[PDB]
Write a protein that binds this ligand. Structure first.
Ligand SMILES: CCCCCCCC/C=C/CCCCCCCC(=O)O[C@@H](COC(=O)CCCCCCCCCCCCCCC)COP(=O)([O-])OCC[N+](C)(C)C
Ligand SMILES: CCCCCCCC/C=C/CCCCCCCC(=O)O[C@@H](COC(=O)CCCCCCCCCCCCCCC)COP(=O)([O-])OCC[N+](C)(C)C
Ligand SMILES: CCCCCCCC/C=C/CCCCCCCC(=O)O[C@@H](COC(=O)CCCCCCCCCCCCCCC)COP(=O)([O-])OCC[N+](C)(C)C
Ligand SMILES: CCCCCCCC/C=C/CCCCCCCC(=O)O[C@@H](COC(=O)CCCCCCCCCCCCCCC)COP(=O)([O-])OCC[N+](C)(C)C
Ligand SMILES: CCCCCCCC/C=C/CCCCCCCC(=O)O[C@@H](COC(=O)CCCCCCCCCCCCCCC)COP(=O)([O-])OCC[N+](C)(C)C
Ligand SMILES: CCCCCCCC/C=C/CCCCCCCC(=O)O[C@@H](COC(=O)CCCCCCCCCCCCCCC)COP(=O)([O-])OCC[N+](C)(C)C
Ligand SMILES: CCCCCCCC/C=C/CCCCCCCC(=O)O[C@@H](COC(=O)CCCCCCCCCCCCCCC)COP(=O)([O-])OCC[N+](C)(C)C
Ligand SMILES: CCCCCCCC/C=C/CCCCCCCC(=O)O[C@@H](COC(=O)CCCCCCCCCCCCCCC)COP(=O)([O-])OCC[N+](C)(C)C
Ligand SMILES: CCCCCCCC/C=C\CCCCCCCC(=O)O[C@@H](COC(=O)CCCCCCCCCCCCCCC)COP(=O)([O-])OCC[N+](C)(C)C
Ligand SMILES: CCCCCCCC/C=C\CCCCCCCC(=O)O[C@@H](COC(=O)CCCCCCCCCCCCCCC)COP(=O)([O-])OCC[N+](C)(C)C
Ligand SMILES: CCCCCCCC/C=C\CCCCCCCC(=O)O[C@@H](COC(=O)CCCCCCCCCCCCCCC)COP(=O)([O-])OCC[N+](C)(C)C
Ligand SMILES: c1ccc2c(c1)CCC[C@H]2Nc1nc2ccccc2[nH]1
Ligand SMILES: c1ccc2c(c1)CCC[C@H]2Nc1nc2ccccc2[nH]1
Ligand SMILES: [Ca+2]
Lengths: 1105, 41, 168, 82
């Protein structure tokens, strides 16, 4: 068929002919007039029954000869005299003209379609996602009129209480009924032009203009609404999406459409809201101005089961007025003022031009309405009764379908309307069965409903009680909500295989992810023997600190808005925002690496940097409250996050705005001093004390009450507890600043000797100055061997990979290898006694030194970068050398553009040679640097150093060179200058941060560097290794000092979440925003109130007169 | 006192304290007219 | 993906069409340069015929680039071809080269001493100067990069805007 | 004139890139020493006798639904930004 729509659905056509009129108004032989003016109970004319066999049944008059027991026919059975057929219509209405050619859809189906057959097209054919609500509108069919307030206010709600939910509004479609006014709201309050509220307007095939235009299989019906008042067929209202053109076989008349409307409104109450919720999608009913049949069908809902509620609004008009007028009377139904039933019937008499014989049962119909004054939510539009109508509808469903507060909560959890919950469920005395609240948290978590999580926490859900092992196993193992495909890709990687078919994730498998994401030696609670034993076993089946487990969940499941919510709660907020930043960042790098799904990788690096900026903005807030304790917050062992540190994490997330913040730069300096007080002391005295060891004793140290915030080593804290003299030499030599200035004076004694050897002639054997030099590099090599073996990891593959990843561990390896190549060729060589420097092996190693020397002078930029003025230029000399490579390629294209012609034009008798590789590159390079070779330009001139190069064509080179240098100096060299000017301020505000971040890795290499410099560091290796064959810097806080510190972090977080609140709520652009929103809501209650005053004074002067 | 950022500050604080005595006062008016039309009727 | 659709998929990729020219052109500039720099005999050498061959087939590739430049007006095709910086320079560089080969090959030979024939010399020196047109091509190829090209485009927008400082 | 010409030479470059890439979609396969074969084997074969987006039918439909969607947002976000 190529169309499932017409494969399943059918169409009704009057396949028989039933006249309904006999009397010849004109032209006594009725056969003539019966052709054109005698219609069937088919509605269509007897000749409009084409129906090819029935077209030949346009015989003399038609089927059933004139007499035929005259009153015989007059029935038109819709069963056999109206058969079915495959649908000839199905398309997309264009609505040509009125707003950007808004679309809608239809089929033209028969009402034969069983209720379940009608639901199983709306979802899968038209891709209408299942609703959370249904706002069938059962008011007046004939057009009616409203007041400017109620017109727009009810247009606020049908947009508000339906855009939030799914809200398949059920209308009549036509531009005359309630369908009329609802569409007018859809334009005035035009929502964000998107999939807005998809109104599913059931239309009859009866009162419909352009019915022929609808007859097209996959046809864009060029539809146009004529407002011709002479017209009688009702045009479809403009603002309606998908239509259901119910086909009864007839035209012009009502009927079948009402049958479908129950029969879809009853199966959508049989479909479930969501996999998590067990309820069915509820149904409401709204009444605008009603009518006689309306007052009947309003009631039957209040009677029939399930109790479909109703939202009959009072202000609209004729019927709805009185159905609400009686709500102001008839208290609890059965109680009935018998003196008012003549009065209200007198109001019924005047509105419907209504009869008194019929005044008992219509009045009676309003009684059982009033016997059910519990779910008939008579919205008093006038006042603030129950709220704006948006809330009234959603409030009508909860209060009235005999539903537990849980069952009320699970619905609002689906709608994602919290305001309903805070003010109609979390109101007052209410049963709140505690197990229920727990189960609701399980649902708000799996989806993403942060706002109900906050709500439930703020109404008694202690996560300690609600975070057991099997519950949290689900929270990873749910497709019932926003999911991250990485997590099921990470787990199958670490398991090194393929997940079995079902595979509910175990929390062990998560630990193997976070220990892989965070990395290094991070060891999570899940993998440890305690958890791994109580887990396989199954308040021990709870967790100690739950929001540390949910925060690693919302960050593996890419639920930021939860992570920001679960981060700000709990404790350790600065370690949670630097673990998160390391989880995401370590997820983002997996995304870029493996491409099995969409990228997602820049969505995370923005999520990480959002956590890696709350930490930094929380360090500042602490550093601005107590600079001392705020440096304890960076070094206290955490013990929930793998015996780690709020500053070793940032370094692992490579977060520079923290490691290069001013509190991680004081501490790094207070750690750089050591026990020394280099505030009271001076750098002269360090060097003076290193070479005069007794001068160590004339130094101003710090007390162990000043070194509180500094992390100290294992035995370092042992000393201070249990200043004596042996604790002066230990305190100095184990200071980083001393470890530094005790190397820099061996290294600057290395470079003064190796340089002395490089420069001075070199004999068969090394000299005293040269053995000390070999000795440094050897012991400096070992110091880098040992720097690998003790680089705080278990994976040799990862230690070696992080060692060579630092700029100098390579260069040192280049410089250490080369030197022993050098010593290899220098010492491991023969000796040509008659003349040294003939042995090209000796020479070779000789010249390894003279070039290896350059590696060691650039070391000094490691030592020289300790300064805060210098280092940020040493880091610039690299960030330009990179960013300038392409200006410099051009300058080498300009250099061969000149050198190849200059060398060809001048030296034309050149056999192939390697000097043709120098001479095309040599002079044009020195030209850039002040040289011009002036007596070589114009080689035929008298003043020539090259009077032999003169010959045919050599007059071209002054021109080539003129163009060359113009391009070099006046264009390309000033393109460098211009480059270095405009990349200076950038690279200067980066090379600082790159420097302040390499400072960590520099200082915290001296806290584990030995004491002794690398000529005689070997003793501190000897006396660390043979003693090792016989068998970090932590913050030691007593017990109360942990307590005072936690009280400080809590205090500083509280201010952070309180000052941001102030900087925004008490800014300017926000303050203009409120002043706008106030003066909005003022001016409404100005003109409204001020009107009423004038309606008083015009009366008050008439009351007295 | 006659700048801009300060003048937005006051205009905020005024429209705060206005709007309190708008809705409060404007309520009471409606509680009169619903009565006044019933005092005479 | 079948095998014949691997070779068709690669060789008909632009990135491949590029890096399959830039390694013929950088093999052109390594040879023409070799000929420019090295002495030049009565007849071209192996390194020099390949060079003539590139420019010829590179000329045709620019002939055909006109005839298939998506238009009907020859007056408009030719006008949009010469309107690009290099279609001129290439025409300067292709003409000049065959002027060069014209004078280099279409010339006599003073056996006692080359470089006396000022026609030979003349074309010899067309090459040594035509070479500059082909090194500036590399700024067409080198401008594919998003860091480099935006300097190659600066070296022109300054040479224009600086003419008057340079007259002074 | 560096910051000017740098915020222009990018745009001049990104615009010559079209005319560069979309010259290779119609450049032959073979480089210009032996592109002649792809001329030979385009011309004598021519004596014997562009890059388009091939969308099925539904993909035109999904694309038009996308353009309509993105225009609607454009005329709706400007409305909000002001
Ligand atoms: C004395 C006579 C002989 C020597 C004189 C001649 C010496 C010649 C010159 C020498 C200059 C030496 C310094 C530069 C080399 C890299 C240093 C480094 O750590 O780079 C990186 C390690 O990046 C890695 O991926 C890990 C290891 C890379 C090793 C590459 C060696 C290249 C040099 C070849 C061997 C040359 C030895 C020649 C001798 C046989 C660090 O990062 P980055 O570099 O800042 O940025 C790159 C970023 N990246 C990490 C993502 C990649
Ligand atoms: C943290 C990790 C990074 C650091 C790496 C550390 C490791 C360093 C890496 C080194 C790798 C480089 C190769 C080894 C060097 C020698 C190569 C060579 O050419 O030797 C020559 C000498 O060979 C001899 O045996 C005689 C001289 C003594 C050798 C001293 C060099 C080894 C010292 C290493 C101490 C390192 C331990 C350092 C402590 C850890 C052989 O050739 P020849 O004799 O010249 O040829 C004769 C020719 N003729 C007769 C014609 C003249
Ligand atoms: C014909 C001549 C042509 C030119 C020849 C070559 C000369 C010119 C070149 C020279 C050096 C080339 C190799 C090293 C530099 C490359 C790396 C770099 O630039 O910076 C990078 C590393 O480096 C730094 O961040 C610090 C910079 C170190 C200073 C370099 C010493 C130069 C002095 C030598 C004096 C000796 C002179 C005497 C010698 C006899 C930083 O760059 P970035 O942008 O952050 O990139 C990302 C980095 N990341 C991945 C780590 C995050
Ligand atoms: C398009 C953009 C604008 C360009 C601007 C203008 C471009 C330049 C225009 C220059 C004017 C023309 C100069 C040459 C004139 C003829 C020379 C001649 O006959 O003999 C000369 C030969 O030497 C040469 O021919 C060498 C070329 C001259 C130097 C080129 C200029 C470079 C510097 C300036 C560039 C910028 C200057 C700016 C201008 C103010 C000398 O006489 P001779 O005796 O034959 O030689 C000695 C031999 N003998 C010893 C055996 C006897
Ligand atoms: C600008 C203000 C200054 C004045 C302007 C007025 C200009 C008046 C100029 C007139 C030029 C004609 C005079 C020379 C001819 C006579 C013979 C002669 O000397 O031949 C020389 C050829 O040298 C040349 O041909 C020189 C260059 C010619 C072009 C002149 C510059 C063009 C304008 C600028 C733009 C150009 C592009 C620049 C870049 C943009 C050879 O002589 P030689 O070198 O001594 O060699 C002798 C030895 N040998 C026999 C062994 C070989
Ligand atoms: C090997 C030995 C001999 C050669 C070595 C000596 C060579 C000497 C130097 C040569 C420099 C050659 C390269 C630059 C030429 C222009 C390139 C181009 O396409 O420009 C433009 C084409 O603009 C047009 O209007 C269409 C054609 C203009 C032709 C101009 C030729 C000028 C050189 C005369 C012949 C010289 C040949 C001398 C030889 C007899 C493209 O635009 P644009 O330029 O980016 O900007 C201008 C914009 N415009 C289009 C609005 C105008
Ligand atoms: C898209 C297109 C853009 C590019 C344009 C493409 C077209 C290229 C445009 C070219 C125009 C330039 C003029 C033609 C070149 C020769 C001029 C000359 O001086 O010739 C000389 C040689 O003449 C001979 O006939 C003998 C040598 C063979 C000639 C080969 C050159 C032509 C090849 C063209 C192949 C092009 C086809 C490429 C495919 C399209 C004549 O002078 P002479 O003999 O030295 O004089 C006597 C010397 N004596 C005194 C020492 C005895
Ligand atoms: C005495 C000597 C005095 C000086 C002599 C002369 C030397 C100085 C000059 C030299 C070159 C002069 C001719 C070419 C450049 C002119 C055009 C230009 O500037 O840019 C224009 C085109 O070009 C570009 O947009 C790209 C620029 C390419 C770089 C030029 C090559 C330089 C290298 C050569 C190395 C060889 C060196 C060795 C040689 C032996 C763009 O300009 P624009 O502002 O956008 O204008 C509008 C453009 N529009 C109309 C297209 C929209
Ligand atoms: C690895 C780390 C080691 C630590 C360093 C300490 C151990 C290294 C120390 C000493 C080792 C050498 C001892 C052997 C005897 C010396 C002989 C000698 O050369 O004498 C010369 C002086 O000395 C020198 O010229 C070289 C040694 C001193 C200067 C160079 C090293 C300075 C750095 C290290 C110290 C400062 C460090 C400060 C930096 C902050 C004098 O003799 P001459 O010049 O040949 O001429 C004599 C006259 N005659 C020829 C006419 C007869
Ligand atoms: C990805 C890279 C791009 C693809 C490549 C680009 C495609 C095109 C690639 C190359 C073109 C073809 C080159 C080989 C043709 C010549 C063979 C040869 O050497 O003959 C010659 C060998 O003989 P001989 O010993 O030199 O003797 C002199 C001969 N003579 C007397 C005739 C002078
Ligand atoms: C148009 C596009 C073509 C595509 C390219 C492929 C075709 C071109 C390939 C080969 C063509 C030549 C074949 C003939 C035989 C060679 C003879 C010869 O010169 O031998 C020399 C080597 O060769 C050279 O020095 C010149 C050729 C190779 C280097 C220059 C081109 C490199 C680019 C192309 C390739 C890489 C491309 C890389 C680009 C990214 C050796 O001898 P000599 O130096 O004279 O000294 C001898 C000394 N003796 C007398 C003592 C013994
Ligand atoms: C040349 C010079 C220094 C450097 C390099 C290259 C490569 C990266 C390592 C860096 N060294 C370094 N020493 C420091 C001391 C204090 C603070 C920051 C420091 N950074
Ligand atoms: C010197 C250098 C390059 C150029 C000129 C002159 C003249 C204009 C054409 C330009 N070449 C070019 N190649 C490109 C490759 C990629 C993207 C953009 C590109 N622009
Ligand atoms: Ca100078």
């Amino acid at each position: 068929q190529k169309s499932w729509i017409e494969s399943t659905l059918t169409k009704r056509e009057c396949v028989y002919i039933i006249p309904s009129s006999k009397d010849p108004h004109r032209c006594l032989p009725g056969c003539q007039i019966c052709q054109q003016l005698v219609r069937c109970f088919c509605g269509r004319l007897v000749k409009q029954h084409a129906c090819f066999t029935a077209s030949l049944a346009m015989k003399y008059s038609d089927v059933k000869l004139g007499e035929h027991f005259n009153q015989a026919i007059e029935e038109w059975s819709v069963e056999k005299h109206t058969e079915q057929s495959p649908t000839d219509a199905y398309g997309v209405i264009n609505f040509q003209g009125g707003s950007h050619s808004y679309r809608a859809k239809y089929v033209r189906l028969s009402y034969d379609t069983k209720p379940e057959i009608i639901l199983q097209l709306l979802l899968k054919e038209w891709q209408m996602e299942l609703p959370k609500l249904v706002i069938s509108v059962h008011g007046g069919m004939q057009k009616f009129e409203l007041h400017p307030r109620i017109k727009q206010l009810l247009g606020k709600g049908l947009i508000k209480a339906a855009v939030t939910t799914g809200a398949w509004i059920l209308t009549g479609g036509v531009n005359t009924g309630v369908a009329k006014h609802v569409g007018d709201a859809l334009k005035e309050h035009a929502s964000r032009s998107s999939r807005k509220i998809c109104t599913i307007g059931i239309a009859p095939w009866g009162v419909i203009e352009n019915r022929n235009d609808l007859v097209g299989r996959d046809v864009v019906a060029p539809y146009q609404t004529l407002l011709n008042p002479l017209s009688k067929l009702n045009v479809l209202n403009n603002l309606h999406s998908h239509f259901i053109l119910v086909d009864d076989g007839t035209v012009g008349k009502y009927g079948a459409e009402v049958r479908l409307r129950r029969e879809l409104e009853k199966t959508i109450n049989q479909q479930r809201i969501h996999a998590r919720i067990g309820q069915g999608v509820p149904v409401v009913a709204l009444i605008f101005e009603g009518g006689p049949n309306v007052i009947l069908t309003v009631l039957e809902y209040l009677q029939e089961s399930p109790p479909v509620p109703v939202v009959v609004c009072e202000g609209t008009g004729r019927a709805a007025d009185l159905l609400a007028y009686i709500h102001k009377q008839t208290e609890e139904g059965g109680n009935l003022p018998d003196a008012a039933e003549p009065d209200i019937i007198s109001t019924i008499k005047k509105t419907f031009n209504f009869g008194q014989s019929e005044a008992v049962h219509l009045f009676q119909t309003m009684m059982e309405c009033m016997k059910k004054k519990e779910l008939i939510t008579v919205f008093h539009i006038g006042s603030e009764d129950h709220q704006d109508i948006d809330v009234a509808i959603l409030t009508a469903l909860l209060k009235g379908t005999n539903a537990s507060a849980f069952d009320q909560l699970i619905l609002t959890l689906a709608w994602d309307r919290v305001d309903i919950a805070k003010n109609h469920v979390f109101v007052y005395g209410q049963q709140w069965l505690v197990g229920s609240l727990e189960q609701a948290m399980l649902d708000a978590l799996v989806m993403d409903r942060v706002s109900f999580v906050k709500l439930l926490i703020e109404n008694g859900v202690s996560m300690h009680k609600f975070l057991t092992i099997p519950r949290l196993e689900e929270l990873y193992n749910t497709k019932q909500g926003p999911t991250n495909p990485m997590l099921f890709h990470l787990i199958r990687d670490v398991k090194q295989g393929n997940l079995p078919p079902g595979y509910k994730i175990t929390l062990i498998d998560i630990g193997l992810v976070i220990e892989y994401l965070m990395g290094g030696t991070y060891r999570c609670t899940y993998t440890r023997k305690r958890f791994r034993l109580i887990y396989n076993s199954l308040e021990t089946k709870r967790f100690p600190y739950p929001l540390n487990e949910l925060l690693i969940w919302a960050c593996l499941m890419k639920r930021q808005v939860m992570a920001r919510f679960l981060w700000q709660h709990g404790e350790e907020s600065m370690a949670k925002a630097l673990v998160a930043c390391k989880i995401y960042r370590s997820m983002a790098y997996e995304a870029k690496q493996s491409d099995l799904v969409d990228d997602t990788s820049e969505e995370l690096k923005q999520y990480s940097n959002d956590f890696g900026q709350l930490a930094v903005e929380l360090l500042e807030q602490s550093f601005r409250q107590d600079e001392t304790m705020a440096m304890k917050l960076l070094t206290y062992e955490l013990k929930n996050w793998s015996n780690s540190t709020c500053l070793k994490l940032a370094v692992s997330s490579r977060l520079r705005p923290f490691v290069a913040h001013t509190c991680t730069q004081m501490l790094l300096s207070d750690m750089w001093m050591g026990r020394l007080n280099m505030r009271k002391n001076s750098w002269y005295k360090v060097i003076l004390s290193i070479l005069v060891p007794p001068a160590i004793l004339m130094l101003e140290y710090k007390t162990k009450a000043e070194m509180s915030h500094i992390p100290q080593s294992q035995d370092a804290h042992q000393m201070t507890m249990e200043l004596p003299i042996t604790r002066k030499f230990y305190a100095f030599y184990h200071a980083p600043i001393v470890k530094f200035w005790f190397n820099t004076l061996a290294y600057l004694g290395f470079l003064m000797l190796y340089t002395f050897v490089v420069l001075v002639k070199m004999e068969q054997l090394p000299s005293v100055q040269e053995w000390i030099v070999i000795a440094y590099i050897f012991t400096y090599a070992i110091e880098k061997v040992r720097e690998v073996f003790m680089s705080e990891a278990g994976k040799i593959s990862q230690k070696i990979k992080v060692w060579f990843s630092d700029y100098f561990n390579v260069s040192d390896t280049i410089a250490i290898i080369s030197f022993f190549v050098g010593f290899g060729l220098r010492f491991g060589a023969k000796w040509n006694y008659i003349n040294a420097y003939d042995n090209h092996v000796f020479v070779a190693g000789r010249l390894i030194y003279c070039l290896n020397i350059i590696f060691w002078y650039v070391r000094l930029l490691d030592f020289l970068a300790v300064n805060q003025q210098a280092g940020p230029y040493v880091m610039m000399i690299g960030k330009m050398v990179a960013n300038m490579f392409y200006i410099v390629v051009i300058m080498a294209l300009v250099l061969l553009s000149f050198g190849v012609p200059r060398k060809a034009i001048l030296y034309p008798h050149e056999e192939p040679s390697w000097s043709l590789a120098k001479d095309i590159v040599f002079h044009p390079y020195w030209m850039i640097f002040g040289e011009v070779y002036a007596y070589e330009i114009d080689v035929c001139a008298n003043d020539s150093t090259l009077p032999t190069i003169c010959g045919p064509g050599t007059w071209l080179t002054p021109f080539l060179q003129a163009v060359y240098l113009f391009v070099q100096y006046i264009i390309m060299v000033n393109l460098l200058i211009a480059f270095f000017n405009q990349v200076y301020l950038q690279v200067k505000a980066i090379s600082n941060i790159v420097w302040k971040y390499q400072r960590y890795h520099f200082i915290m290499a001296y806290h584990e560097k030995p004491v002794l410099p690398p000529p005689l560091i070997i003793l501190s290796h000897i006396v660390s290794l043979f003693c090792c064959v016989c068998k970090g810097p932590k913050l030691f806080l007593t017990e109360e000092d942990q307590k005072k510190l936690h009280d400080f972090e809590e205090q500083c977080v509280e201010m952070y979440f309180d000052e941001k609140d102030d900087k925004f709520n008490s800014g300017s652009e926000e303050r203009i925003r409120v002043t706008f929103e106030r003066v909005e809501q003022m001016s409404i209650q100005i003109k409204e109130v001020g009107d009423r005053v004038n309606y008083i004074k015009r009366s008050l002067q008439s009351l007295d007169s």
